Amino acid sequence: NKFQLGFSTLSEELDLESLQVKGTIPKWLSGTLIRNGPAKFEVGKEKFQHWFDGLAMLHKFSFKEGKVSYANKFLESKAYQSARDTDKISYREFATDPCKFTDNANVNVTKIAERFVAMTETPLPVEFDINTLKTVGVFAYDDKIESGLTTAHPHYDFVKNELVNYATKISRSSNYNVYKIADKTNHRNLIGSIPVEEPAYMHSFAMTENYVVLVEYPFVVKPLDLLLSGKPFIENFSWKPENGTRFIIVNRQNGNLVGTYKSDAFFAFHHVNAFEKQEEIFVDIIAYQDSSIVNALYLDILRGQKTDTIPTSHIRRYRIPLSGGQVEYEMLSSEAVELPRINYKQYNTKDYRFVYGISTYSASDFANQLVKIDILRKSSKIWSEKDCYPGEPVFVGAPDATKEDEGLILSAVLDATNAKSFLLILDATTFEEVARAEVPHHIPFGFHGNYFE
Template sequence: MPEQFAQGFTTLKEEIACDSLPVQGSIPTWLEGSLFRTGPAQFEVGQQRYRHWFDGLAMLHSFSFQAGAVSYANKFLQSPAYKAAKETGKISFGEFATDPCRSIFQRVASAFSSESGANANVNISKMGEAFVALTEIPLPVEFDSRTLETVGVIHHDDGVAGQHSTAHPHYDPIRRAGINSITQFGPKSHYNIHTIADGTTQRTLIGSIPVREPAYIHSFGMTENYIVLVEFPLVVNPLSLLTHGKPFIENFQWKPELGTHFHVMRAVDGRVVKSYPGPTFFAFHHINAFERGNDVVVDIVTYPNASIIDNLYLDKVTTNHETALWGAFTRYILPLDGDALIEEAITEEGIELPRINYERNNGREYQFVYSCGGDWANPNDFLNRLVKIDVQAKTAQTWQEDGCYPGEPIFVAAPQAHAEDEGVLLSVVLNSAKGNSFLLVLDATTFRELARAEVPHHIPFSFHGMYSSLREFEGKF
């Protein structure tokens, strides 16, 4: 199986701009805007090789739609990490699981300064009117949405401290502000929850949670009134980040005896109203969270432990990883007037990279989740299907094609949509038989293929992105 999808972890050096991709099927004419993606695209520099999927140098991709046609462009993000690699022929900045040999003095200096490669290969978001690429280092990189040219690293000039943020900020339409969590490592470590109001890059602290051994946190939940931060027992002694000489994630230790802890913070004033001990598990991605009466409901893609991180090292994922690269859809019900949480399995489908109708349902009760998925009976394969889950009926629909490996499905609502699932899904798919990729357009209601647009090269497996309508572009330009 690994030989089928191995190309998804190989370097793409070519940067192109295609005014019109060949389309099979029919793309809805109402789809007018652009899909933006970021992800690792270069896995070696000179004689050095990045060690983990999460480490490769970032490349931006855009698919733009108008009148049923689709264009495509890709361009490397001109981050400090990329520029240094081009200039020196070496890996010059530490990444998630790759670290060039640096002295203890360089390590200490970089841990407490703004030095970073800003290799924003994880997610795309908007900061006010600016389009930004994100990673877990709290330095977004702005790019021009028309040309994909890099504008530059955004430095936050404020008093909110921290060295590691989630790559999944939320947006609060009532406050008109982005919300995120940043971990401050030090003798006194904290999770600092903050906002960034539209029109500014300055962060404002909502609240802070002290922690002795910070956990690795990739995402969090948000309801209409609460922030939900989940601490998994993959934790670090902050001193290790300075003294052990290991790549970032290899300083963390799995301590199952700690269990998992859920913190519910009131968004209006940062007060933690409840903290719940929970069962031991690990997760990258929250699906959604919402309030139901006196309960806070949190939906997460869960793993029994953190071995998923080890299985995504490049020398393992492309040969023979030990366990499945997808998790379980698990619901946790947190009673605000009680002390014990309730755990519930929603579906038997193995899923990862989940998306919902965010604008309509984030922080609210919802019905549908869209995700990549895998076959529990074939754990050595990669994510090879798309899955639509009806959360209320606990049923699932799938799209799958032999030799094809789809990426994160992004939901785009149809104009004047009435139903939650009225729209399309956009997913970048690797076709291992042909050695290239295509953009898949699915009807989100029926889960049937509407169209596909072929790209002349393969696109390495990426993580996340966003869709921006033409209306948003017109508002910006």
């Protein structure tokens, strides 16, 4: 297919002070954008089976007075170092086993204890230096919380200055362990433990003012299958729609169980935003009908001539009545959307109007548009370019902004005909280009990135 290059290895690592810039990047952009994703899809004659298995590479876009610098290095995880030095896959990935959890932290990046960390879904992040992109090593937590599975989608409370996440202890007495990390510590405080027979794959979760909401899609594993089966991690998970989806609501200041509520079965990788209003919670999710999208992101499908087989996801607003009752939803947009982002700093946990994402609607091609959904005016704005495949749109608010959509969108875009990627900068209000920075190579299709001031 045309986008095949986005799922092919990038072996080139370089450090460049200036990229060729078209347009003008506002003077006030003084921070660094870090992109994480897979960038090596084979090790000698052995191939990684899934998109999620590729060995983590970081991309650094640092903004100084209208100019932009770029650096990219592979994360020197034990997974990477072992593959490089033995030419054997040596750690168990999401969907590939070799012929000890992987530290292939290829999903996201954040800061814990004032240190930059790469994250996957195994228990421990991997610390890296933002200046050099060199790997420091395993970032240990300083606590007794047991876990075998977690998210690379921590929430952050700006008022209390706390990271919030959960970790699942997978055993014959499995538990969802909801925790927080105060600034300037790597000690996790256990907020609450919810016991569970068959843990669900919950890639992300919802946070409100007072709550963590775990949305437990009925895509679940038998602990003993995970311990004993010869099969890669994700193959041990089963779709059981007869369970329905369970919404688990935990007070995230005192760990009190607010309640559990059930809707009809659905699956999701990514939450958009959630908020309390009266005695109700609204949870906005990028929802699929079932878990089949997981099998659709195997590389042989992504690289193949049947990509219209890849199921679409849409923004569903679930309404949880705390007073009690079945959880119903409505669609916020008819657009197929993935990789959702918001004005997180100002609107996470709050009523809001604007979602940014990639279009998966297949009007003209696979994942070829950026979209901005106006939830209020049930409308959308679109960016696209012949033979271009744009990555996750990262919002950056402007200084002393008075509006939710006053700022910039940053997206790593693959130009398939040019066989090279560019950073695209849109004004968030108009959703039109203000600048782009050329990169001398292709940036493989990634997952998540964050802007650090």
